[PDB]
């Protein structure tokens, strides 16, 4: 199925599967904001699971592999979504349309992760990242983050998404050199999103040592 899709049909399928922008129950402690962020991420996980089902090639994987990919990439996917929503708000992170925070509103040690999310958002803003490119990167994170922690089928879908990204950059009038450079630039950011997720997961386990039944099982997957 996924291998029999055009680049345009790949874009429309990913754009159609986008999860909604959820609201928070905002309006403040360090633990009251963490309650808002945990409650928001918990409700977002429900939509992400149903979003992953609609990613081309994901249903073809076994239930154990689907559980594994989501367990490894759930925080990465939440972070790239937060960074995408915050593009048009410099110096601020848009967790929800009614929750827009900057540096000062950032919890013991969460400031370092906040600055990295802001730097990632400004990086997307300098690149003028398109929504067609964003949905490709987010689906790449889902398939790639746990592909070596278990495979030929997953890498085949990843090659098709790369073809889709190059197809988009060719429509934007970019030359062949500009297409390869921008493609490399986008994928190197995924290395930073993995870094932010690892540091965030480390900070999330320290708070459990100080949510809901799903967010705990997601946290226990990373030990």
């Amino acid at each position: 199925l996924a291998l029999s899709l055009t680049a345009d049909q790949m874009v429309s399928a990913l754009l159609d599967a986008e999860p909604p922008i959820l609201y928070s129950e905002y309006d403040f402690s360090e633990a009251s904001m963490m309650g808002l962020l945990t409650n928001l991420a918990d409700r977002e996980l429900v939509h992400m699971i149903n979003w992953a089902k609609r990613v081309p090639g994901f249903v073809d994987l076994t239930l154990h592999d689907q559980v594994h990919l989501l367990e490894c990439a759930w925080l990465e996917i939440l972070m790239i979504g937060l960074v995408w929503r915050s593009m048009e708000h410099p110096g601020k992170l848009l967790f929800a349309p009614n929750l827009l925070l900057d540096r000062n509103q950032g919890v013991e040690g969460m400031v370092e992760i906040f600055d990295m999310l802001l730097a990632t958002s400004s990086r997307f803003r300098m690149m003028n990242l398109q929504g067609e490119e964003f949905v490709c990167l987010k689906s790449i994170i889902l398939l790639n983050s746990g592909v070596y922690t278990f495979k030929d089928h997953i890498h085949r879908v990843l090659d098709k998404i790369t073809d889709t990204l190059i197809h988009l950059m060719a429509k934007a009038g970019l030359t062949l050199q500009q297409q390869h450079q921008r493609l490399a630039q986008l994928l190197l950011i995924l290395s930073h999103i993995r870094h932010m997720s690892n540091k965030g997961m480390e900070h999330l386990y320290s708070m459990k040592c100080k949510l809901s039944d799903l967010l705990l099982e997601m946290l226990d997957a990373h030990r």
Binding site: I49, A52, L63, V67, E71, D213, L214, E217
Partner: peptide, 8 residues
């Protein structure tokens, strides 16, 4: 696993 149930 709740993730396994929601995926099913």
């Amino acid at each position: 696993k709740i993730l396994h149930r929601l995926l099913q």
